[PDB]
From Swiss-Prot, chain B:
This is Flagellin FljM. Flagellin is the subunit protein which polymerizes to form the filaments of bacterial flagella. It comes from Caulobacter vibrioides (strain ATCC 19089 / CIP 103742 / CB 15) (Caulobacter crescentus). The gene is fljM. It comes from the Bacteria. In C.crescentus, the flagellar filament is composed of multiple flagellins of 29 kDa; 27 kDa and 25 kDa. Belongs to the bacterial flagellin family. It is found in: Secreted; Bacterial flagellum. The chain holds residues 56 to 110 of 273 of the full protein.
């Protein structure tokens, strides 16, 4: 029972650590978006970065 | 003599046209600077990573 309780506690801490991983309201790892695109040239070409849900 | 003396009006009109073109060039310098700033603003706005307030 003590081991399963510690296991559930760590499983909740994983949820909280994944939830807090934002930078100014945007996150590449919390799973709210499929990808982020950043500027790569003056004409507006994207620099795609696929999201990795955690 | 009347033909030679009539040229002063032509010179005056040419100077007035040069002055008008100069004022237009000053306004054009201002307009190109504003257009370049709008370029940088739209290019910054294209990025998907910004939050709503920056947009």
């Amino acid at each position: 029972n003590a081991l399963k309780s510690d296991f559930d506690s760590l499983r909740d801490q994983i949820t909280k650590a994944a939830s807090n991983a934002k930078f100014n309201g945007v996150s590449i790892a919390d799973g709210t978006t499929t990808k982020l695109s950043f500027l790569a040239n003056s004409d507006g070409s994207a620099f795609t970065v696929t999201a990795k849900t955690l | 003599s009347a033909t030679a003396g009539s040229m002063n009006a032509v010179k005056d009109s040419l100077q007035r046209g040069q002055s008008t073109i100069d004022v237009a060039l000053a306004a054009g310098d201002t307009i190109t600077d504003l257009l370049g700033k709008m370029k940088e603003k739209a290019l910054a706005a294209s990025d998907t990573s910004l939050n709503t307030a920056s947009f």
